[PDB]
């Protein structure tokens, strides 16, 4: 039961009590994923308009 690093100020205080010792995707890569999904949406819609034109 030890207390370490006691710090006090006008608005409070803090300390540590020990009970026992122990024993990314780049900007370009994000643009591709976004444009890839956008392209898939465009393909699906193009097939819908093709279906409707038939």
């Amino acid at each position: 039961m030890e207390v370490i690093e006691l710090n006090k100020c006008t608005s409070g205080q803090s300390f540590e009590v020990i009970l026992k010792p122990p024993s990314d995707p780049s900007l370009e890569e994000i643009q591709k994923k976004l444009e890839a999904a956008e392209e898939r949406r465009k393909y699906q819609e193009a097939e819908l308009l093709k279906h409707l034109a038939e």
Binding site: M1, V3, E5, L6, N7, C9, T10, S11, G12, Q13, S14, F15, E16, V17, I18, L19, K20, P21, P22, S23, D24, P25, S26, L27, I30, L34, E35, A36, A37, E38, E39, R40, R41, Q44
Partner: protein, 438 residues
């Protein structure tokens, strides 16, 4: 002094954000018009509260906050609310139609077209900072914007602010206050893509907040306003160290150092006490031992789980009000001899304690009673993995039939992202088990 920028995404983030800044202003003595009489440095200053508030030459203290939502009705509340004068229009961003509870719609379809605008507005706040610490991001798991757009924003923030910490306040979905059925999909999809971009995330389960409001506040059917006022108290407890003089958790980096030894396991369990009904005739003021002992009761945890059957990696005690170290240490001694507190062998068995003498501030007319001392314990328990297991199981039930998957594929997401995200969650559950179980 180092600044913190708060980002509120989707309805949950925006409404929780509104409740927090209301509380922050009451805690710092800032009026709705932005004036702060106690602030003797007009138009400047590097005080602790300046980490969250900039100042204009006219003495207005302006939150360092951006609000983002793909539909205007929620952010319109801020524009005409009590604290409308706090923010300028650049800080409030709204689209015209939302993500329809569809992760793929918030992330891909709509996110692609608004991300650059959101970064521009955040860049403007950053240009006002002499030493930006990082970001606090508020969002739901279940919403299409809160899940889908948040994960995109977090990815871009890691690119544009590589050396900045990012913490989350995430709303975990609960059927008692949700009319959506696809939220397990959105929660898992957003956790997968956000995991490597978040240094520390505080999950709040609406189920837990809901039951506390019914149990302690005698609210038969809690509303979002009741939930958000209680949540903002817990958020205030957690961010107080950044907004007041002190030596514990003084910058965002310290949250990871003190709470997250292993990066992927960065979801601390929050526990708060006491929550007392303001309508009560008059409550008996609880002692330090009593509110400290309350931190080990499942009923006041932000996520319902059983820490008796996990292992602790870190434990922080944040006190507000009439508390002295003598009483805290005496209470900890009593609890160790009575509670099931097992730390991992590669972590010391101890507690970091912070005390702020200012007792919790209650919003006039709110549901919470004014207490003389309160505490919020942040502990990293493997027991919070119960929350992931529950969520992953609902995911598995719907995905076995591909139920609702067509809505996501229809917005340009590949079905393989589901399985990729699910396998990442299985690996996260495995990590918790390797650290907690023998």
């Amino acid at each position: 002094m180092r600044e913190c920028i708060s980002i509120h995404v989707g309805q949950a983030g925006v409404q929780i954000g509104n409740a927090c800044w209301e509380l922050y202003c009451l805690e710092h003595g800032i009026q709705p018009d932005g004036q702060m009489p106690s602030d003797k440095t007009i138009g400047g200053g590097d005080d602790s509260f300046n980490t969250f508030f900039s100042e204009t030459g006219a003495g207005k203290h302006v939150p360092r906050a951006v609000f983002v939502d793909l539909e205007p009705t929620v952010i319109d509340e801020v524009r005409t609310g009590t604290y409308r004068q706090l923010f300028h229009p650049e800080q409030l961003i709204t689209g015209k139609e939302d993500a329809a509870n569809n992760y793929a719609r918030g992330h891909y379809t709509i996110g692609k077209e608004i991300i650059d605008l959101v970064l521009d507005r955040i860049r403007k706040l950053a240009d006002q900072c002499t030493g930006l610490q990082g970001f606090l991001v508020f969002h739901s798991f279940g919403g299409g914007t809160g899940s889908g757009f948040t994960s995109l924003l977090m990815e871009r923030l890691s690119v544009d602010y590589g050396k900045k910490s990012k913490l989350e306040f995430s709303i975990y979905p609960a059927p008692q206050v949700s009319t959506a059925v696809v939220e397990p999909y959105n929660s898992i999809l957003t956790t997968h893509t956000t995991l490597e971009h978040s240094d520390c995330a505080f999950m709040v389960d609406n189920e837990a907040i809901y039951d506390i409001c019914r149990r302690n506040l005698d609210i038969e059917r809690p509303t979002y306003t009741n939930l958000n006022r209680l949540i903002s108290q817990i958020v205030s407890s957690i961010t107080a160290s950044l907004r007041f003089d002190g030596a514990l958790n003084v910058d965002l980096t310290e949250f990871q150092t003190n709470l997250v030894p292993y990066p992927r396991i960065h979801f601390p369990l929050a526990t708060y006490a006491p929550v007392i009904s303001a309508e009560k005739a008059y409550h008996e003021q609880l002692s330090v031992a009593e509110i400290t002992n309350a931190c080990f009761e499942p009923a006041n945890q932000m996520v319902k789980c059983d820490p008796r059957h996990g292992k602790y990696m870190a434990c922080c005690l944040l006190y507000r009000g009439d508390v002295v170290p003598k009483d805290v240490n005496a209470a900890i001694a009593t609890i160790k001899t009575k509670r099931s507190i097992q730390f991992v062998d590669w972590c010391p068995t101890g507690f970091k304690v912070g005390i702020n003498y200012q007792p919790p501030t209650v919003v006039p007319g709110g549901d919470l009673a004014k207490v003389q001392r309160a505490v919020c314990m942040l502990s990293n328990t493997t027991a919070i993995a119960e929350a992931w297991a529950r969520l992953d199981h609902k995911f598995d039930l719907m995905y076995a039939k591909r139920a609702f998957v067509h809505w996501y594929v229809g917005e340009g997401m590949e079905e393989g992202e589901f399985s990729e995200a699910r396998e990442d969650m299985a690996a996260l559950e495995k990590d918790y088990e390797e650290v907690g179980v023998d």
